């Protein structure tokens, strides 16, 4: 059939010219059913065609087509644990998205893809159903129904072939877990390939760190229950006999550094092979080469094994590359944080020989800063340069402002409330501004803190603090007196050795006192300041303002911040008032804690703690009573009521503010009081010395699988507090509180573990040596924040 005209109907997205090019047939030529079929096939192969029907009009060749309907929108339902936006991202990555045509043949394909994603994320019984709703103008809407079902959990992690170590102990270090006690925060019970690989690597490292050089993993198996709700993990290993390190040999282009290197490889002949030690040696060699200038010092160690004598001979291959140089250091993604804050954290100065270790340290510091969710590194090559490279850091900004709330309970502070708002990055400048407020049984605290971590690029930090403090003594089982104070402080920070830290600063504090019960010790200071309050009444007041020069030193070496096993912590805080201030006194404190493990695994550790405090006036005055050190509680000496150790108050005869019948009073004038009065209420002292020797052992009864999360310790605590300005001769009848010989001792058991409701600590103590008036408290615990 000769064709004189060509017409189409339904062409919406495909241009008429493009379709005309597509169909082989053209106007002005004979056409047959074969050519019509070929054109229809080509149109359908175009991919944008749904219903093709070539039609011959009276003379024209008319074409009609619905075409593949366009996807107007995508809807989701049932994705409880899967987020809609990321699911849509996955769909568009697969190809299906808004604006594109919907293929009426792949519905099962998208369903199976989504089910595969569910399997990957953990759910294995997930079923995905798609509903298609036709719409006018060849528009279509698709709705996906998700039945997430349940996610299978690991029911067991079995290891076969192990004889040297128990399977529970081996799993103790695994990221994956099979038991999740409700009273322990150990983790979830999900399964992931990355977690399995990490667990395998951890097991291999553990075995290699004990002389089992020939350790090998034959294979692993993963099995599911018929219900597809339980997961079983099995690992088969073959632990060989232990081995000894005969010696170490090195060879390579050391670049004339052989003499220095040998000192790093020295070992004691007849030791146990240790992969960790080998890795440390390799890292030390790499660091030395980097110090020498080389940027990519490849180092390899291939042990040589002699089974006849069970000896291992390390063979170290050293390869030092070429000395590269860094031309530029660029940062991308810091749309908020300025360039300087990122740059000052770098350890590879621009325009110097490159160092991989330095770059990694800089990346680690940037990650530690916490302002960035993700940090990436790249080392590009400058165009046409054999030794010049550009270091580029890619970062993703992370929100810094964080509202914070906290609740805690304890036998010392009772009910505690913590609430504050913190901003670590103020307008992307590194300044840390935050407001915090603390409330407890016997004090209310609120402060505003502003600090610049880098006052000088060397690392000096400038602080700043404004605080309002309210203190009630009666609620703190001390002599009744109320102290409301407020002031501001500014301090500096001097990092000198990456473990020590010196800090000095000035501070102004105004103290207001009211509702004070008369007592000899307190009135000593009050008279020393020239005040002459009345004895018969407690409606006394006293206001003061002081400027003090604050200084302190810190030393941190603990291996781990939680459950430390080795290291030492020493703190020394000292403050003294400067002239002009009403008060004239100096206070010095010294805290110390030492951990010494006596076992290779560091399970058994001896812990020793000490605490020293002293102070006194300068210009014939006395240290203010409200700054006295307090002893007793769960922090200084267990088994004693909080702030109960030390000199006890001596009350003068006075009339009660509001006498009440059948009401306990401290021998008021309405109770036949005609002379000085003894009591059993602590008042603190100007000198304190607390020493605590603690012995740590593994928990015996808890399952070894997760027993490492609970710390059990036997402690023997001793402390003492006394006053250095107590006139014993003047008051002979009452006990001499100026003699420090009255040492207090106690002992007991202590427990500690991480709990879903915050940290938990328990301690049962039986004080065996106490003096008159001391109040005992065997049971003590603190659900801290």
């Amino acid at each position: 059939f000769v064709v004189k005209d060509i017409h189409f109907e339904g062409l919406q997205r495909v241009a008429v010219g493009a379709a005309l090019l597509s169909m082989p047939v053209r106007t002005g030529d004979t056409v047959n059913d074969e050519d019509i079929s070929n054109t229809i096939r080509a149109l359908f192969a175009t991919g944008n065609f749904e219903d093709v029907r070539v039609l011959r009009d009276g003379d024209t060749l008319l074409v009609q087509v619905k075409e593949r309907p366009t996807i107007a929108s995508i809807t989701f339902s049932g994705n409880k644990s899967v987020k809609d936006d990321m699911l849509k991202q996955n769909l568009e990555a697969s190809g299906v998205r808004v604006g594109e045509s919907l293929d009426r043949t792949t519905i099962a394909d998208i369903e199976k893809g989504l089910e595969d994603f569910y399997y990957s994320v953990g759910k294995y019984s997930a079923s995905v159903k798609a509903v298609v709703t036709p719409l006018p103008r060849n528009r279509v809407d698709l709705k996906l129904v998700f039945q997430e079902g349940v996610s299978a959990e690991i029911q067991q992690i079995n290891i076969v072939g192990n004889h040297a170590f128990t399977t529970d102990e081996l799993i103790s270090h695994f990221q994956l877990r099979d038991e999740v006690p409700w009273w322990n925060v150990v983790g979830d019970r999900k399964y992931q390939k990355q977690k399995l690989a990490g667990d395998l690597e951890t097991l291999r490292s553990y075995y290699l760190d004990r002389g089992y050089a020939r350790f090998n993993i034959d294979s692993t198996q993963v099995s599911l229950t018929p219900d597809k709700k339980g997961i079983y993990v099995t690992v088969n290993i073959t632990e060989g006999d232990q081995y000894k390190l005969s010696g170490v040999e090195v060879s390579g282009n050391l670049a004339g550094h052989s003499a220095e290197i040998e000192q790093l490889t020295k070992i004691e002949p007849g030791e146990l092979y240790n992969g960790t030690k080998v890795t440390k040696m390799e890292d030390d060699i790499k660091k030395l080469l980097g110090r020498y200038g080389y940027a990519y010092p490849r180092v390899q160690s291939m042990p040589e094994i002699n089974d006849a004598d069970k000896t291992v001979k390390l063979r170290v291959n050293v390869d030092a590359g070429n000395r590269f140089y860094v031309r530029k250091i660029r940062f991308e993604g810091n749309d908020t944080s300025k360039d300087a804050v990122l740059r000052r954290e770098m350890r590879q100065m621009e325009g110097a020989w490159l160092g991989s270790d330095l770059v990694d340290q800089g990346k680690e510091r940037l990650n530690r800063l916490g302002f960035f969710e993700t940090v990436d590194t790249d080392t590009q090559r400058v165009p046409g340069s054999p030794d010049q490279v550009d270091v580029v850091y890619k970062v993703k900004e992370r929100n810094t402002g964080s509202f914070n709330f906290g609740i805690g309970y304890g036998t010392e502070s009772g009910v505690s409330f913590q609430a504050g708002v913190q901003q670590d990055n103020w307008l992307g400048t590194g300044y840390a501004v935050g407001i915090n407020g603390t409330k407890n049984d016997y004090q209310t605290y609120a402060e505003l803190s502003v600090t610049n971590p880098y006052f000088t690029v060397d690392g000096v930090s400038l602080g700043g603090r404004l605080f309002y403090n309210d203190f009630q003594a009666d609620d703190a089982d001390l002599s009744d007196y109320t102290n409301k104070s407020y002031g501001t402080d500014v301090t500096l920070g001097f990092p000198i050795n990456e473990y020590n830290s010196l800090r000095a600063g000035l501070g102004y504090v105004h103290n207001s006192l009211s509702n004070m019960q008369p007592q000899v010790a307190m009135w000593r200071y009050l008279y020393s300041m020239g005040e002459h309050p009345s004895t018969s009444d407690q409606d006394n007041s006293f206001k003061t303002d002081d400027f003090t020069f604050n200084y302190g030193w810190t030393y941190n070496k603990l291996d781990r911040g939680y459950f430390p096993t080795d290291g030492s912590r020493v703190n020394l805080t000292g403050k003294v008032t400067i002239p002009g201030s009403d008060n004239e006194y100096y206070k010095v404190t010294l805290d110390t804690a030492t951990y010494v493990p006596i076992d290779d695994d560091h399970k058994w550790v001896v812990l020793g703690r000490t605490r020293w405090g002293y102070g006194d006036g300068l210009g014939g005055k006395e240290m203010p009573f409200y700054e006295n050190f307090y002893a007793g509680g769960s922090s200084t000496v267990r088994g004693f009521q909080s702030n109960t150790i030390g000199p006890k108050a001596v009350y003068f005869p006075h009339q009660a503010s509001n006498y009440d019948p059948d009401y306990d009073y401290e021998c008021a004038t309405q109770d036949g009081a005609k002379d000085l009065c003894k009591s059993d209420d602590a008042v603190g002292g100007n000198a304190m010395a607390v020493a605590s020797l603690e012995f740590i052992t593994p928990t015996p009864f808890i399952s070894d699988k997760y027993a490492n999360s609970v710390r059990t310790s036997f402690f023997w605590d001793m402390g003492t507090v006394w006053d250095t300005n107590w006139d014993s001769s003047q008051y002979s009848g009452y006990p001499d509180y100026s003699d420090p010989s009255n040492i207090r001792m106690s002992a007991g058991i202590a427990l500690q573990w991480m709990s879903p409701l915050g940290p938990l600590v328990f301690s049962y103590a039986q004080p065996f040596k106490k003096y008159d008036g001391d109040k005992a408290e065997q049971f003590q615990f603190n659900i801290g924040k």
């Binding site: 402002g401 964080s402 914070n404 709330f405 906290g406 609740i407 913590q418 409701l757 915050g758």
Partner: peptide
């Protein structure tokens, strides 16, 4: 217990 809510 201690809650934090980044804003």
């Amino acid at each position: 217990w201690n809650w934090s809510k980044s804003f």
